[PDB]
Design a protein around this ligand. Structure first.
Ligand SMILES: CCCCCCCCCCCCCCCCCC(=O)OC[C@H](COP(=O)(O)O)OC(=O)CCCCCCCCCCCCCCCCC
Ligand SMILES: CCCCCCCCCCCCCCCCCC(=O)OC[C@H](COP(=O)(O)O)OC(=O)CCCCCCCCCCCCCCCCC
Ligand SMILES: CCCCCCCCCCCC[N+](C)(C)[O-]
Lengths: 79, 88, 102, 221, 90, 51, 220, 68, 89, 90, 50, 75, 68, 51
């Protein structure tokens, strides 16, 4: 017995590219904070959003890096 | 003793190498073994297998010739192989 | 005939019958190879000549993606007068104890 | 992979694979028969070795594929089968009988017996009784003893087949030489005249059809 | 556990040519691979999945398995063609 | 039988001769199963037969 | 780089390419014919094999180019959607039919069919009555059946051409021997008198152009 | 991944629960003392795990790269 | 924002073997030259080298370039490698 | 000190074929490895073992020894195969 | 050494630096003998053909 | 066994009883958390423990890296 | 060793001795500071030795291959 | 004996000729063991004979 093939959403991703909500919200929260740098209710929000943006951006970079090393290692295996 | 299998493989290949010197000349003389017939990658693979099939000593103990000058020995064995090739 | 293509499509934002209207306005609909599924749901099967299948699959996927920019959930405001009681919470300072009615 | 040593062994095997094909598969035989044919027609460089080895490897694929597939599914099989060292060593050993049966079916009984006895006399000492299993069930002989017997058996039979094919061309050559001497043209090299007669003879026979048919039918009923 | 399928019966070898078994093997591998790559990419974008310690511990395993699978296939195919070169060129 | 029959690659090597009456196939099938050494199953859509 | 298992498959194919050319293309035939020309003229070392093979390789490209072009545009240029094992398998297979048809045009049916049955291995030793020499077809044999039947057909064709090429030069030197025996000069070998005659005969025939042209014309 | 044929989550719920209790009354010293311990153990667990999973990846990669 | 596209670029019929080379060579040398230039002027511009959303793009561009040139080199080497073996042998 | 056992006179009046010597070596190694991997994973899962300094200091040694052993077996095997290639390869 | 002292000294850096010399040198010696025998046989074949 | 366990053990046979003393002092303190005489002793023992465990672990790390280098230069 | 067979002190001894002394009192700064530099010098020595042995063997392997 | 018998490969190389009773097998088996140089064990399910 063998696991199922799955089925491929060929078109969706490449044109799902577009302006992310996350950067938009980070810049909006910063612009709200800069108007009143001493409000705790705004500081608490911005700490959380900036943190999430940090994690997301790192995870993405490390992933692109891993996927392209595999391809460079294949070509270098055959030449 | 951990490295004993590694050394035991090297004793094997040293014995096969010294057997090739005596078996290959026969393959040169006989009319169904010469390179007019049997050539390319099979040739060495088969000669080595035969030499291991006939070597007289247990393959897993150190070869006795490590202390001797290699050239006089190799020439000696090749001469013996040429004599056997003629008689066969 | 041996070239027939078939595919399963799943849509999140658009109903099957909504997509049908698009095909009809386009003048692309073809009653020999109609879509098969539940008008009320978002999943269907389609099969036919290559060109028709490819066009259908692409069009539907783009319709669904673009409808991620539309919004349904407009809020409304109700104003409701209370006829039998005060809206605000009350506090009764008993000489011995303060008590609250929310 | 679920285990690291299972991986190391697989990479070692995949590194020694070509010599196993070169010395323990019918390729050793097909390769010889085609060179014999080229010698017979008196040609030197055509067809090229790369062309003859190409067809020899393709034809060997039809014959060896079933047991390689069998071993593959046997070692992939996902059902629970072993627990401990004795069961694992027996499971691995049991997986090779599909190929021991092949080597044994085509090796010459006399050679197999020689290489077996000569190993017993290495390990246990020459005074151990010489078996003379003249009526025999050869008790699952070791593959290092079994493999060179196969190699020399295939060389024997390929030479044997190659011999038969010469005899028509030998006739052609001796005839041509006799008629030229009957005319006294002692200075004429026969080979110039006899080469085309050989070519047209072989083409009229359709040699490659007959030969490639029979070579395969020898391996399957 | 959300949606799963398995293929129970494999077709008899008695009716399928030698090159069909290859096409059929290749296709299945190429699809399971494109599907895994896509799955990982989608896990990296759902903000719930990318920021929860529970889910990251899964993504790390998924990416390590993908890497080992492709390195394995790319090594054994190179050994496979190297055998053919050794026999024919030699 | 009114069912498509799928026969294993191994079992398809066996041969038979004679004059046969398919009056009650389920019973005849059970009969020959033991004589010839076959095994069989029925999932509701087709009959699978093995060695 | 698209799907990387498709990348592995491409690099593998690219590595095996010279053996496929050496065993499944009309290079097989042109290479042999030109060498036989040299033997029939009796020359031992000139022209070089480097030259003869270079020519044969060039000429064969003209014949094969129409097929590689079509395969390229079919696979690589066209973007297509496919989603499952069966759809992909069929898509890939359909691309090869342009080459498959060439092999089946130049291969011999009963041998191809024998190899097919040999690799099914079914019920084997099927008799000549299992065949009836049919004529017109929509069969699609395996390529692993078609390659060796092709090789073994091309070789036989080459030998046949080599039969005719020898004849005129065989006449040319038996005449020379007979004239030398009409004189007394039986001590002298023909070869040093015979060779220049063969060279003029061949240039007067312009054999190289007739050969190259006629070899091409078979595949048009 | 299984070796073919070979014979042979609570801490997450516990941390979630303690968080939900604490969030209701952030000033209770007993709820604070409890949450401090649950969170410290969960942190150590996740770190030890991910380091081990990397060490095994890197051994498999070194093996392949030795024969590649 | 100033952008242009050349549309009527290529002929799809069967054509002589000599010119498929020239057209492939020229189109490739052009693509790589412009790609490399855009990479370098993305690094020299201070507004692009310091924005985390822009750097993530430059990373992809660099990697794609690396892979494309690696592959054109590999396949060309195996191409001439075939010819030299068929001829020497 | 728990469950010790040793074989005696292993080669004194019987000798194995190389065919078997390799097979016994492979089996005895592969099972020890798989058991060590399970032991490590279990020592990581148990909440009482990943939170006590005394038990962590024991687990660091286990991971170090596993990593060194598998690296040494892999290197020696590769080097020994190389010699047989240099012998057979024409 | 067969069941005397102990096995598995994969781990002490002083003996592990002595094993490196032997493991290398024996591999080189065995590699050299393989070439010398081929040379010798090739010299005999060269003379006998010529 | 192994040499890296030999190095690890060379600490544990060095600090004879600390492993016990720490837990014993903890039990006493837990019995009367407000006795300065107890507190003062626990501070010392706990510090001596923290240092012992850090020195041990970093040394084992270093000898592991020496061996992992040599086994690579075997190639 | 106590042994010579007829026919100073090295870093290997000095490290073993300084470790042995330290382990008796892991919290003395004089002993710690005396041990850091011995463990460092031993690490450097034991790397440099192996790297140069490796260079001499690759030289001899290249010679044998060049005369193949 | 009423029990299956398993003979090791090495022990299977010896040859015997004559005329035997097998009346009391357990006794006979012991006697023959010391003449031929065999050793044997019995687990309760099968008799194992080795050199
Ligand atoms: C004669 C054949 C020798 C070279 C064979 C070229 C095969 C490489 C084709 C390829 O895959 O790369 C396409 C490659 C990529 O094009 P694209 O994928 O269509 O964008 O195109 C090229 O860059 C062609 C480069 C040709 C350079 C070799 C010149 C030939 C030798 C010098 C002439 C004298
Ligand atoms: C002539 C050919 C003679 C030998 C052919 C076999 C080649 C493999 C030799 C590899 C050397 C093993 C060195 C291991 C070093 C070590 O200490 O590990 C021990 C290690 C543990 O040692 P322990 O202390 O005894 O437990 O055990 C192993 O892991 C052994 C590794 C076994 C892997 C062998 C895989 C066999 C694949 C080759 C089969 C192909 C047969 C074709 C014959 C040649 C073509 C004609
Ligand atoms: C043995 C007789 C040879 C006679 C010459 C054979 C033909 C080749 C050379 C003459 C060709 C006729 N041509 C073109 C000069 O007129």
């Amino acid at each position: 017995a063998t696991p199922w093939s799955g089925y491929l959403d060929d078109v969706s991703a490449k044109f799902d590219t577009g302006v992310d909500n996350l950067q938009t919200q980070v810049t909006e929260a910063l612009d709200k904070l800069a108007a009143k740098p001493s409000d705790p209710a705004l500081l608490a929000a911005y700490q959380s959003k900036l943190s999430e943006y940090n994690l997301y951006r790192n995870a993405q970079s490390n992933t692109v890096k891993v996927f392209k090393d595999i391809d460079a290692a294949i070509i270098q295996n055959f030449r | 003793m951990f490295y004993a299998l590694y050394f035991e493989i090297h004793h094997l290949v040293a014995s096969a190498a010294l057997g090739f010197a005596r078996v290959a000349p026969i393959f040169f003389f006989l009319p169904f073994l010469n390179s007019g017939v049997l050539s390319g990658a099979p040739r060495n693979a088969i000669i080595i297998l035969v030499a291991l099939g006939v070597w007289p000593h247990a393959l897993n103990e150190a070869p006795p010739f490590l202390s001797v000058a290699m050239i006089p020995l190799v020439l000696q064995e090749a001469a013996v192989g040429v004599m056997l090739g003629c008689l066969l | 005939a041996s070239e027939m293509r078939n595919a399963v499509v799943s849509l999140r934002n658009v109903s099957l019958n909504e997509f049908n209207n698009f095909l009809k306005r386009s003048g692309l609909y073809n009653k020999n190879y109609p879509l098969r599924g539940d008008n009320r749901k978002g999943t269907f099967y389609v099969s036919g000549p290559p060109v028709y299948v490819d066009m259908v699959v692409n069009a539907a996927t783009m319709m669904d993606k673009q409808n991620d920019g539309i919004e349904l959930g407009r809020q409304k405001i109700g104003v409701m007068r209370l006829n039998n009681t005060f809206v605000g919470d009350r506090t009764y300072n008993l000489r011995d104890q303060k008590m609250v009615i929310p | 992979m679920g285990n690291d040593i299972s991986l190391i062994a697989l990479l070692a095997f995949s590194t020694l694979l070509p010599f196993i094909i070169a010395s323990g598969t019918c390729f050793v035989k097909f390769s010889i028969v085609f060179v014999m044919v080229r010698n017979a027609l008196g040609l030197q460089q055509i067809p090229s070795n790369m062309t003859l080895n190409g067809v020899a490897l393709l034809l060997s694929m039809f014959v060896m594929w079933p047991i390689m597939h069998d071993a593959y599914v046997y070692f992939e099989d996902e059902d629970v089968t072993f627990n401990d060292i004795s069961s694992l060593s027996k499971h691995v050993d049991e997986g090779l009988d599909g190929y021991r049966d092949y080597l044994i079916k085509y090796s010459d009984r006399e050679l197999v017996q020689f290489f077996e006895n000569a190993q017993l006399k290495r390990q246990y000492g020459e005074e151990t009784e010489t078996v003379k299993r003249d009526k025999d069930e050869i008790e699952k002989p070791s593959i290092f003893a079994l493999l060179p017997a196969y190699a020399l058996s295939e060389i024997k039979s390929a030479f044997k087949i190659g011999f038969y094919l010469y005899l028509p061309f030998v006739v052609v050559d001796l005839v041509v030489s006799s008629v030229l001497l009957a005319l006294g043209m002692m200075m004429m090299s026969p080979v110039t005249i006899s080469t085309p007669i050989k070519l047209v003879l072989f083409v009229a026979l359709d040699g490659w059809t007959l030969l490639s048919k029979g070579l395969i039918l020898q391996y399957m009923d | 556990v959300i949606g799963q399928a398995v293929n129970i019966r494999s077709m008899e070898t008695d009716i399928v040519s030698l090159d069909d078994r290859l096409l059929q093997a290749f296709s299945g591998s190429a699809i399971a691979t494109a599907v895994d790559k896509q799955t990982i990419t989608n896990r990296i974008e759902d903000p719930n999945l990318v920021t929860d310690p529970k889910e990251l511990a899964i993504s790390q395993e998924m990416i390590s398995d993908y890497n080992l699978y492709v390195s394995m296939v790319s090594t054994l195919t190179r050994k496979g063609v190297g055998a053919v070169e050794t026999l024919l060129r030699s | 039988l009114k069912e498509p029959v799928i026969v294993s690659k191994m079992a398809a090597r066996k041969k038979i001769t004679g004059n046969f009456e398919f009056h009650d196939p389920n019973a005849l099938l059970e009969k020959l199963s033991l004589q010839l050494g076959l095994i069989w199953y029925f999932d509701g859509q087709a009959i699978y037969i093995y060695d």
